[PDB]
Amino acid sequence: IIGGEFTTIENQPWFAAIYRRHRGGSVTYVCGGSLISPCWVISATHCFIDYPKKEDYIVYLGRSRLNSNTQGEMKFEVENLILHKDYSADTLAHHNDIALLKIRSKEGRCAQPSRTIQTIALPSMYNDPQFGTSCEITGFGKEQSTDYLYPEQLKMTVVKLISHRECQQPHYYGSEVTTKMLCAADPQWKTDSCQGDSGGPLVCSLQGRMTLTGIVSWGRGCALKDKPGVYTRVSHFLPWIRSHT
């Protein structure tokens, strides 16, 4: 996250931290995700497509820091890694960039709700906030494009949803943005998602309920003028989510 503020997991209790174990024993951060039910984390397919082996992955809930144990955190393995069959990536745009991870502790249990571990509500079909609405993103991604390491502490920021018409302008993304995507950015281009934030939540306070409106997917650079973050539009994937579980 470029700009914004540091945060703690009790403020983002649906946030899932996803890591990959390498041969030799080293573990590296991959992407964020969101807990949508006790056994299911939703993320982005591009995070896993090149290494689609479920045994590779470790998922934490209730974790505020990249390389430290948060009190109350829960560690999980991935019982099922479900990638979207029609995934593809153009120069910038990702398509069907959505993935499900069925999580299971070493004892075979799913998430246990607590102050620091909570599910986030899904939207109803095609029900999004209006453009101009402020929404939050959360992640461990880069704080500057020039960084080669991720921050140790979780971050969040607030961005505004941008209309399809605006995002399809020639100086924005033209026809590379589709109706299965949502654009969001800072009007002054000072805060944005970045590399490492993919798969994480775009959450909007929607008609009384904190709602998973988007999944961090793509964007040209980070916090660049006229180059919003682009998010998988969760309200257009509900049949896929419900069907795969």
């Binding site: 290494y51 993919s198 964007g219």
Partner: peptide
Amino acid sequence: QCWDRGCENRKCN
């Protein structure tokens, strides 16, 4: 070009 922020956990060849 290497333009896309969403390039986590890639092989790159």
